[PDB]
Design a protein around this ligand. Structure first.
Ligand code: NA
Ligand code: NA
Lengths: 452, 452
């Protein structure tokens, strides 16, 4: 008794991750064979505009010729190696040099992983290693924010600030979640945005005092929270929090897995938000989704401190088999060049006003609580009643209903909580942006007619 | 002040992993540009026989035309996508079907990752998730062995059984390490191999009784410990320990990252050691080193149990951006076919007797305590005195000296503790095997003459 169809074969042998099981059993798996620009095509020849760039990562679309050619050229040249035991590829050396150049740091060091989750798990281990070598082995606690998304390893999931991780008995101890700087949701009745920011700065100081400054290893922040629902921080957030972190000597890590390489309208989200971190975590767009790469980019201060610590023990006992893979490195070098120098990053800057203008129009609807975002990352929040910010009952699954209707209309978008997220490829044309909105608006009309 | 040479550029921008820093500063980074069969070629045009397959993974060598062509063919077809939110590529469905087929399981499910570390971290989360869903949230402890290597995330590093992880303040609580089944090292004076295995089985039962079976989530084992120094278990080990684990309702996981796809002389190390695990962890050879892929392959029992638990919460909140990437799946499908059907796994079986006969002759030297291994994974243990099994002082760095001397002779091998490991590509000919040993023997003569 064996499955025949693509859908039945997918259900027979897969253990689905991040998949709504009632929707999958009703609809079946979407099995994808190829793409063209920002579109994907399934086994039945149905085409969909992927307004999420797959998982925010396919910024140059699904059939980019330059990137396809660069990947093919490296398989022909040198198809695989590692970057451990004093060896690495020429591609690895070139990418480390390029990443330091394009980072906001004047100098630094790069460590590779396959994923953003491994890179955050790596940065945590690096802090534990460094602080212990410096005589502060108790400096282990990691500060992140509620609604932050840092990954899926036990450590990077512990950094992630969502109730869903309770199914794993996570977070592990030592992982502290601060208030999410989403003013619309977390600002209290009668609390101004200025007071909200002052409260988060106070809450951080109280946390450092109650935990003990000598017990805190680092602070990680996505400049704009991505997978958490596209959450630009409340005005003045970083200007209020960063001096508190610097005062208590707590390293600042910018998780640039989503914001890195152009989505916020600048090469880095930390540049958009005008702050210089001690380290950067990069993945996703790093290869435009063509290869699994992650990177820890260490600024001058942490590089020098880790270098001293590594020299004293004579080795850094950490790494992954494919870290610094020559194919991944050649692909990243091309992705960086394509985004920065072939007009993709500029296109996000060019089209962001038109993107916001349309969302502002959509937000006039009685069932849209707000629109939020920047550059090419945006979200629309659904509400039952606007004035009170009352959401629809969780059992109505409004966001999944919108995303499913979108799929039926030939549009892929990302549902999260009571929100619908749009993070389309940087190659999106004005006509394709209109197509994305026309389909989304049709889906919103359908769903809200059913639930309101 | 900018670096000029490849070696200087590597040192300026890299944060080195698994690299002995005193040797790196003395020798410089070996910067690799391409390879040919089992050989790698550096920027200076020097060629080395890589008798470690890179990091055990490059079993088809460094320029395999079939694999290069399969990689190129998939980049032209569909160069990137994910396997989340009820979508995946046709290549993902084909690979999951193929992996269940080639696994020792009659049926099951596959979950993808990029690495073996993420796959072990994933299996641990799956166990915590499952046991809590089945009414036992206290069922969280993970059993591994001393000298085991399971990866580099904080959790897979806690599963790993090496003192070097103390630099990170690891292992985390709940990671229990059993005696390594290395008879030569851990066997007591006057203890026979049968008594040694009986003792290991008694220690396991006492550990279970003292920890409480209701608190133990699972047991992981590499059939042959690979990165830990090539350690085949003492005779009858799995036959003694598995009934105990089965009696106490402790899931058995075979870490097949190194043993999967041919290195022990069978498709799986669990086949070579005649046991059926509840799940398999695969990575490394899965793609012959051409793309970062990891996989959790769940047997019928855990597949059914996890599906029931996931259905109750409607969504399994876990996954990685590149999990089930179409390119990695197309490459894995080719790598499995190349290894199983193009004579590579058979070449391991063909040449394993000749491999062992030469190691047996080398082990006659007074400074070789033992040779150990199976198929295409072997190790030589260095000793100051054979009769008393006394090693050379740690400060002499004997294994490192042999490895460095091998590099100077055009041979790459793997040093670990007091041992030197050989894990060559499956494409190795008899002449290349002879070249491997001729170079190793000269390195052994040089090091032992200076040190003994
Ligand atoms: Na720079
Ligand atoms: Na099978």
């Amino acid at each position: 008794n064996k499955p025949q169809s693509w859908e039945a074969r997918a259900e027979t042998y897969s253990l689905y991750g991040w998949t709504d099981m009632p929707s999958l059993h009703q609809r079946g798996t979407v099995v994808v064979t190829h793409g063209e620009g920002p579109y994907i095509v399934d086994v039945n020849g149905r085409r969909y505009l992927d307004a999420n760039s797959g998982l925010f990562n396919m910024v140059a679309g699904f059939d980019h010729k330059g990137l396809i050619d660069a990947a093919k050229a490296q398989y022909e040249r040198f198809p695989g190696y590692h970057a451990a035991f004093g060896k690495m590829s020429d591609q690895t050396v070139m990418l480390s040099e390029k990443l330091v150049e394009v980072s906001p740091f004047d100098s630094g060091r790069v460590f590779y992983t396959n994923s953003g989750s491994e890179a955050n798990d790596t940065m945590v281990k690096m802090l534990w290693f460094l602080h212990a070598a410096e005589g502060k082995p108790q400096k282990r606690k990691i500060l992140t924010r509620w609604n932050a998304y840092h990954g899926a390893t036990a450590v990077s999931a512990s950094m992630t600030g969502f109730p869903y991780n309770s199914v794993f008995g996570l977070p592990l101890p030592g992982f502290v979640h601060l208030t999410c700087p989403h003013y619309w949701r977390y600002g209290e009745e009668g609390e101004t945005e200025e007071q909200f920011v002052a409260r988060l700065a106070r809450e951080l100081e109280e946390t450092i005092q109650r935990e003990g400054a000598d017990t805190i290893a680092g602070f990680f922040a996505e400049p704009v929270m991505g997978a958490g629902g596209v959450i630009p921080p409340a005005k003045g957030y970083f200007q209020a929090i960063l001096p508190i972190l610097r005062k208590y000597d707590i390293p600042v890590i910018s998780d640039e897995v989503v914001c890195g390489f152009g989505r916020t309208g600048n090469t880095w989200g930390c540049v958009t938000y005008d702050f210089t971190p001690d380290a950067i975590i990069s993945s996703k767009n790093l290869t435009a989704g063509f290869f699994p790469m992650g990177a820890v980019i260490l600024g001058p201060e942490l590089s020098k401190r880790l270098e001293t610590a590594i020299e004293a023990i004579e080795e850094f006992p950490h790494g992954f088999t494919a870290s610094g893979h020559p194919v991944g490195c050649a692909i990243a070098l091309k992705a960086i060049d394509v985004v920065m120098n072939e007009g993709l990053a500029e296109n996000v800057r060019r089209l962001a006003p038109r993107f916001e203008e349309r969302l502002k129009h959509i937000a006039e609807r009685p069932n849209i609580g707000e629109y939020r975002g920047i550059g090419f990352m945006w979200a629309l929040e659904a509400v039952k009643d606007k004035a009170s910010k009352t959401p629809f009952d969780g059992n109505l699954s409004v966001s999944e209903r919108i995303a499913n209707t979108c799929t039926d209309l030939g549009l892929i978008c990302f549902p999260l909580g009571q929100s619908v997220v749009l993070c389309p490829p940087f190659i999106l044309t004005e006509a394709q942006m209109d197509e994305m909105f026309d389909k989304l608006e049709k889906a919103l009309d359908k769903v809200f007619a059913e639930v309101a």
